[PDB]
């Protein structure tokens, strides 16, 4: 109770005097309608309060009533197949409460307080529970939602409720301390959830897209960042990531991005099907969505709510992927509120604690052994949008120092319709060497030397492009024009991948190993036949180049027949000279 009154209103920023004793980063109800705000920069008796909704029509002298706890999420069953705003309130309950417009002042609860889950316990009375141990089990859309002890709670079980239908809030396990455990618990969004151990990553994150899961792979507990100009193919890339990856659950954080490309996810996901199991796809994604014109302070809340939901489903034991886009819109939100604070800015206008908070967010990923004793992982894919289309920004060159796997979209490859628009020469990944033994185990034995041959063909092309733009394809020899043509046919028929053909929007690594092996076999025996003396210009018109070109369109079920057929024909096309 630090009940005080407003002194000054400006933008989304409310300086309230009369609040001595309120702490930093506390939930406040500003004004008569209970607009949620958070305390920063407190002095004297005052408190600078940012508000996650819009002050318009607030008047000075309205009361600010602090709560005394930081921004806390409710974590438990009933969040999958869900869509939330920045401070975790479901939008469809709002739509059933209000019209089609988001009206401020509305309070609903983040979980259903009526839906009856089917409890089954796994603790006898008298057991010793530490933090993170499972209590029991609830079925949910074909997932098996494991209800945990909160990470700060330790004691012995006084009583256990028997199995059967319950709501969320009923006390399912009561400890001997008098402490009662419901199906859910709150958590402060800025504090990383506790953990038993950090592992080191030796299992890739299979995206589905060929260039990502072959040339620049990313392991299961890996951060990965994707910058690009506007209209370059970021959001389509992350929708294909969230539509095809081999993760259990997927948290999509739309942090300051447009609404038609979130209604896309609401409308055309439940027609689809999860590839690992038989559920529909919308049963595995939680979707946090603070769009553009929804208020500007809540973007920070959006990024943190998404990452702490992902940490909850990691602690259960799942393997969560978090596609958070436009972290630079969150950096902009920080810039606007530091404008209101009249702090001094760093370079470009961003406040100085920007990189500290970006590190404090991206280090929250990474393939842990949980408190419960079973492993899990959060992988983070962060989209970065530069404000000039340059990678010399504070956001971009502070996000490339704390990630591996930096996939750098360009615009020339987007101006021609060549998708995905990955700039090969400036993208990289540091998860290759650790994913060597997994590839040698589960894909093929000679897989990494093959891929390094692809990499050195593309390097020799990017070496020769200097010369060929400085003279022409005139005056290149027989060998070097072949290197040009093989690099071009890789760029058109291995890396290039539309996401609208039904086949060839997912592409397993058996199929990508096949396509690389077809192009290496073609190249090798073509240079063998080019020392033996032919004209290259009739190598470049064989009826096998179209079949390697159409190799990517054929189905993942009828592929190995097609691969054996085209390897026979690629052996047989050159012996006819």
């Amino acid at each position: 109770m630090i009940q005080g009154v407003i002194q000054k209103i400006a933008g989304p920023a409310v300086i309230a005097k009369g609040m001595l004793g309120a702490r930093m980063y506390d939930i406040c109800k500003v004004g008569e309608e209970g607009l949620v705000g958070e305390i920063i920069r407190l002095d004297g008796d005052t408190a600078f309060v940012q508000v996650y909704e819009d002050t318009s029509g607030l008047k000075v002298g309205e009361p600010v009533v602090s709560t005394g706890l930081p921004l806390a999420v409710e974590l438990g069953p009933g969040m999958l197949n869900g869509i939330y705003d920045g401070i975790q309130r479901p939008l469809e309950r709002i739509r059933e409460k209000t019209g089609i417009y988001i009206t401020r002042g509305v309070v609903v609860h983040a979980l259903d307080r009526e839906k009856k889950w089917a409890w089954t316990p796994m603790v006898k009375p008298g057991d010793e529970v530490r933090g993170g141990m499972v209590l029991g089990t609830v079925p949910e859309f074909g997932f098996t939602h494991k209800i945990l002890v909160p990470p700060d709670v330790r004691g012995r079980v006084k009583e256990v409720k028997p199995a059967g239908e319950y709501t969320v809030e009923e006390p399912v396990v009561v400890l001997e301390d008098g402490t009662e455990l419901k199906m859910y618990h709150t958590w402060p969004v800025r504090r990383a959830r506790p953990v038993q151990r950090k592992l080191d990553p030796n299992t890739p994150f299979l995206t589905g897209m060929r260039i990502l899961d072959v040339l620049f792979p990313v392991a299961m507990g890996g951060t990965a960042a994707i910058p690009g100009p506007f209209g370059s193919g970021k959001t389509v890339t992350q929708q294909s990531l969230a539509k095809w990856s081999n993760a259990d659950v997927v948290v999509y954080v739309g942090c300051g991005e447009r609404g038609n490309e979130m209604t896309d996810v609401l409308v055309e996901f439940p027609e689809l099907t999860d590839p690992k199991t038989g559920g529909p796809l919308m049963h595995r994604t939680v979707l946090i969505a603070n769009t553009s014109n929804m208020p500007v302070a809540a973007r920070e809340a959006s990024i943190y709510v998404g990452v702490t939901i992902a940490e909850y489903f990691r602690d259960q034991g799942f393997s969560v992927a978090l596609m958070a886009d436009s972290t630079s819109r969150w950096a902009e939100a920080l810039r606007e509120i530091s404008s209101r604070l009249e702090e001094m800015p760093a370079e470009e206008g961003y406040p100085p604690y920007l990189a500290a908070r970006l590190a404090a967010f991206y280090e929250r990923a990474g393939k842990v052994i949980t408190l419960g004793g079973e492993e899990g992982a959060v992988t983070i894919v962060g989209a970065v949008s530069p404000p000039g289309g340059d990678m010399s920004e504070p956001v971009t060159q502070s996000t490339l120092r704390i990630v591996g796997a930096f996939w750098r979209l360009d615009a020339s490859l987007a101006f021609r319709r060549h998708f995905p628009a990955i700039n090969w020469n400036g993208s990289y990944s540091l998860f290759t060497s650790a994913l060597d033994p997994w590839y040698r185990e589960n894909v093929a034995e000679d897989y990494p030397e093959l891929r390094d041959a692809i990499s050195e063909l593309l390097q020799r092309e990017a070496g020769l492009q200097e010369i060929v733009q400085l003279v022409g394809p005139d005056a290149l020899q027989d060998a070097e024009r072949l290197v040009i043509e093989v690099g071009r046919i890789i760029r058109e028929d291995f890396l290039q991948q539309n996401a609208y053909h039904e086949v060839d929007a997912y592409c397993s690594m058996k199929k990508a190993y096949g396509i690389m092996k077809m192009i290496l076999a073609f190249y090798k025996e073509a240079e063998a036949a080019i020392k033996r003396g032919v004209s290259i210009d009739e190598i470049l018109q064989l009826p096998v180049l179209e079949r390697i070109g159409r190799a990517r369109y054929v189905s993942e079920e009828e592929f190995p027949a097609y691969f054996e057929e085209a390897m026979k024909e690629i052996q047989g096309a050159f012996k006819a000279l």
Partner: protein, 463 residues
């Protein structure tokens, strides 16, 4: 006998002001006790007669004005140091992070360094083998030298960091015979690393046996930035202690000087002042000179400090201020390249833009071997005119070169994959030189114009 200044006002982001503190020195370290009891760290900037300012290290969350109190600790920042700390890991501030108990500090030292006296600094004279052949032959690290490694972004600079860490030794064989004892140490300051790179390092050190002579100052990225500023001070004062009071030859490896300079820029913006060129602070040159000029041999002292800082140039330019000022204090650079790395060559040093400004007074007769500088010059010029012949043959056609250019082509292409593509083996200096003469012996005698007559007489004609 603590003395809690309670009575604080104005917490803002990182800062908090204490009302009546005329006792705190400028630049003290302080405990900030919360309402509940978690203790944070802070450094005192801007002490004045009506308030004092504290920059809190970590997050400010539980803080209010009623129940919050600061307390002095160690009013100028010291490090408690022993000889014993040669198996230990630390986190910026200098607290053990491996479960072994705290050391018994036989001395305590101020972590900002006093500057050496140029009358009492003799010159760097003898070499230190790294095992990496493209270093040890063409641009030799000598003792008392600072030379950085200009990484890129995607390049494995951390892996070549660990390789020089677990592989460098001096070698008292090939000097004038010099008491083999000559103990050795690697101080390893990784500032601003990930978790992944940290688990990489504390497995890469533990597997060989090379943690029993090193010391690791590691901090992650989600640690306080002011700890990251304190880190190279800690490492250099342990190293300077060891080398000039217990006669060690210390090699100090400063990982990610870019992350140092970024933390320096953000703390300089927190100090409420105005930056300089390209947004980095004005005093950046002096603040890098403070932690590079703490290396070198000393007249009279047997010890020696050598310093490899490994830094990633931001957007691949040497005209950024970070590689600008670093190469403008340090001596030479060795420079990784994405081209050799994409062809798949480890370690991907190309020796054409690389340079050591102090090899020439470190190698030669009696120090390593007689022919060393001549071999290095001949390798450099022969690979350098092998490269442009390679670039030429993409339009000329291999027929229309002579015999001699063709031999340079084969030289370049076998050079960059037998001499550079080392793998993870250890090439002591004579194995490096015998591969050097085997590589030069794809050229005829008398094409080797730089080497004098006796070395061509004696070592030529191999492989």
């Amino acid at each position: 006998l603590k003395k809690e200044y309670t009575g604080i006002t104005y917490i803002s982001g990182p800062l908090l002001f204490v009302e009546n503190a005329k006792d705190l020195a400028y630049g003290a370290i302080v405990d900030i006790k919360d309402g509940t009891g978690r203790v944070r760290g802070g450094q005192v900037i801007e002490v004045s007669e009506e308030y004092a300012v504290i920059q809190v290290f970590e997050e400010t969350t539980g803080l209010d004005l009623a129940t919050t109190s600061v307390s002095l600790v160690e009013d100028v920042a010291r490090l408690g140091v022993s000889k014993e700390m040669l198996g230990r890991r630390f986190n910026g501030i200098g607290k053990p992070i491996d479960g072994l108990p705290p050391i018994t500090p036989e001395k305590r030292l101020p972590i900002t360094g006093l500057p050496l006296n140029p009358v009492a600094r003799r010159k760097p004279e003898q070499f230190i083998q790294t095992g990496i052949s493209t270093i040890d032959v063409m641009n030799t690290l000598v003792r008392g030298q600072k030379l950085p490694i200009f990484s890129g972004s995607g390049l494995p600079a951390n892996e070549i960091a660990a390789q020089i860490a677990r592989q460098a030794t001096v070698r008292p064989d090939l000097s004038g015979e010099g008491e083999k004892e000559e103990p050795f140490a690697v101080v390893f300051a990784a500032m601003g690393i990930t978790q992944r790179e940290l688990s990489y390092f504390i497995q890469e050190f533990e597997r060989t046996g090379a943690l029993s002579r090193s010391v690791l100052f590691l901090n992650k990225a989600d640690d306080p930035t002011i700890e990251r500023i304190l880190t190279p001070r800690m490492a250099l004062t342990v190293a300077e202690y060891l080398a000039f009071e217990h006669d060690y030859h210390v090699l100090v490896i400063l990982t990610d000087m870019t992350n140092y300079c970024e933390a320096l820029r953000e703390i300089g913006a927190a100090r409420e002042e105005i930056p300089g060129r390209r947004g980095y602070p004005g005093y950046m040159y002096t603040d890098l000179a403070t932690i590079y000029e703490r290396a070198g041999v000393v007249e009279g002292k047997k010890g020696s400090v050598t310093q490899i800082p490994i830094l990633s140039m931001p957007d691949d330019d040497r005209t950024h201020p970070i590689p600008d000022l670093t190469g403008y204090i340090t001596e030479g650079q060795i420079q990784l390249s994405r081209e050799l790395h994409r062809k798949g060559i480890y370690p991907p040093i190309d020796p054409l833009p690389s340079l050591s400004r102090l090899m020439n007074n470190g190698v030669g007769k009696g120090k390593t071997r007689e022919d060393h500088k001549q071999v290095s010059d001949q390798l450099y010029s022969a690979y350098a005119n092998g490269v442009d012949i390679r670039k030429l043959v993409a339009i000329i056609g291999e027929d229309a070169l002579t015999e001699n250019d063709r031999r340079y082509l084969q030289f370049a292409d076998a050079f960059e994959r037998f001499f550079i593509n080392q793998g993870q083996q250890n090439r002591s200096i004579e194995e490096s030189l015998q591969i050097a003469w085997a590589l030069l012996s794809m050229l005829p005698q008398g094409e080797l114009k730089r080497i004098s007559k006796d070395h061509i007489g004696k070592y030529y004609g191999q492989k």
